[PDB]
Design an enzyme around this catalytic site. Structure first.
Site, mmCIF file in Angstrom:
data_model
loop_
_atom_site.group_PDB
_atom_site.id
_atom_site.type_symbol
_atom_site.label_atom_id
_atom_site.label_comp_id
_atom_site.label_asym_id
_atom_site.label_seq_id
_atom_site.Cartn_x
_atom_site.Cartn_y
_atom_site.Cartn_z
ATOM 1 N N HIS B 33 1.078 -1.127 0.004
ATOM 2 C CA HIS B 33 0.048 -0.062 -0.094
ATOM 3 C C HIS B 33 0.836 1.336 0.054
ATOM 4 O O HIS B 33 0.474 2.340 -0.615
ATOM 5 C CB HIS B 33 -1.084 0.196 1.168
ATOM 6 C CG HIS B 33 -0.283 0.068 2.375
ATOM 7 N ND1 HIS B 33 -0.294 -0.974 3.260
ATOM 8 C CD2 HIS B 33 -0.110 1.260 3.367
ATOM 9 C CE1 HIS B 33 0.311 -0.384 4.266
ATOM 10 N NE2 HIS B 33 0.441 1.054 4.410
ATOM 11 N N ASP B 63 0.372 -7.419 0.499
ATOM 12 C CA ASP B 63 0.581 -6.102 1.072
ATOM 13 C C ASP B 63 2.016 -6.171 0.930
ATOM 14 O O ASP B 63 2.718 -6.031 2.182
ATOM 15 C CB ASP B 63 -0.018 -5.756 2.397
ATOM 16 C CG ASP B 63 0.043 -4.242 2.417
ATOM 17 O OD1 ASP B 63 -0.823 -3.690 3.484
ATOM 18 O OD2 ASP B 63 0.693 -3.484 1.708
ATOM 19 N N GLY B 139 2.914 5.781 9.728
ATOM 20 C CA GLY B 139 4.215 5.959 9.476
ATOM 21 C C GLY B 139 4.958 4.681 9.572
ATOM 22 O O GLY B 139 6.194 4.586 9.211
ATOM 23 N N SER B 141 3.815 1.753 8.502
ATOM 24 C CA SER B 141 3.820 0.762 7.553
ATOM 25 C C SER B 141 5.196 0.517 6.955
ATOM 26 O O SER B 141 5.871 1.144 6.765
ATOM 27 C CB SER B 141 2.651 1.387 6.503
ATOM 28 O OG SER B 141 1.640 1.430 6.532
ATOM 29 N N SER B 156 1.304 -4.113 7.910
ATOM 30 C CA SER B 156 0.511 -3.701 6.929
ATOM 31 C C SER B 156 -0.528 -2.601 7.639
ATOM 32 O O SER B 156 -0.876 -1.687 7.017
ATOM 33 C CB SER B 156 -0.506 -4.874 6.497
ATOM 34 O OG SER B 156 -1.408 -4.629 5.690
#
EC number: 3.4.21.81
Lengths: 50, 185
Positions: B33, B63, B139, B141, B156
């Site tokens: 993402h 992801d 932040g 991720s 994720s």
């Protein structure tokens, strides 16, 4: 537009928004979850950090 | 630059997952993402130090994404913060794990479920995710989930926060390593 909320989880990229509570919300999903939690009392002040 | 460090795209900030390579080509993994719609990545908010360009992205459903280093000077450590990473492993229920991200730093916890479905809305559903009781915030991720020297997953999404506690879901890293024919070093 927090119509699609609440959400059980949010992705975690940082793209900040500034709430009427003067708190920086990390992304729109975090902000909308907080609006729901506030029973619609919290609003957007502006885009970006507070 | 190592696992957990900030990475910046044109839209926002994520964290670097793991440094990986195939032969002599160095890349980093991050969340799908984060790489969706992103082309260039930089190491700073000023966008003055280039890292590289997105080479692949799988989101939703999975992801994970991968960025090819174009920067020749930046050190590409095979670590998470100071921690050595030497192999990749599959998560198991009960496994003690650690996450590092660019907002919250390092947090620890355990795997509580496997193969979870997470619906992020708008048709953005991810499947096969690792569930944990480690917190994470925006932040974070793409940051690494590791266990001692073993690479486990990429951050994720989740709910809650680090102050009250949360739940975070991670994409299994073995799936990404296989998809791109890359290895941790």
């Amino acid at each position: 537009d927090c119509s699609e909320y609440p959400k059980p989880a949010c992705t975690l990229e940082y793209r900040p928004l500034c709430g009427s509570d003067n708190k920086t919300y990390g992304n729109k999903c975090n902000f909308c979850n907080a609006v729901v939690e506030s029973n619609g009392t919290l609003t957007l002040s502006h885009f970006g950090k507070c | 630059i190592s696992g957990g460090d900030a990475i910046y795209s044109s839209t926002g900030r994520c964290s670097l997952g793991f440094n990986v390579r195939s032969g002599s080509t160095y890349y980093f993994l991050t969340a799908g993402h984060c790489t969706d719609g992103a082309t260039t990545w930089w190491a700073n908010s000023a966008r003055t130090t280039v890292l590289g360009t997105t080479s692949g992205s799988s989101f939703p459903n999975n992801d994970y994404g991968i960025v090819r280093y174009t920067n020749t000077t930046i050190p590409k450590d095979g670590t998470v913060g100071g921690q050595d990473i030497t192999s990749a492993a599959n998560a198991t229920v009960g496994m003690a794990v650690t996450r590092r991200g660019s907002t919250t730093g390092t947090h620890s916890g355990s795997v509580t479920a496997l193969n979870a479905t997470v619906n992020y809305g708008g048709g953005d559903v991810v499947y096969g995710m690792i569930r944990t009781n480690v917190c994470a915030e925006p932040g974070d991720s793409g940051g690494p989930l590791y266990s001692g020297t073993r690479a486990i997953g990429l951050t994720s999404g989740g709910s809650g926060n680090c102050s009250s506690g949360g739940t975070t879901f991670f994409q299994p890293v073995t799936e990404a390593l296989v998809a791109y024919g890359v290895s941790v070093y």
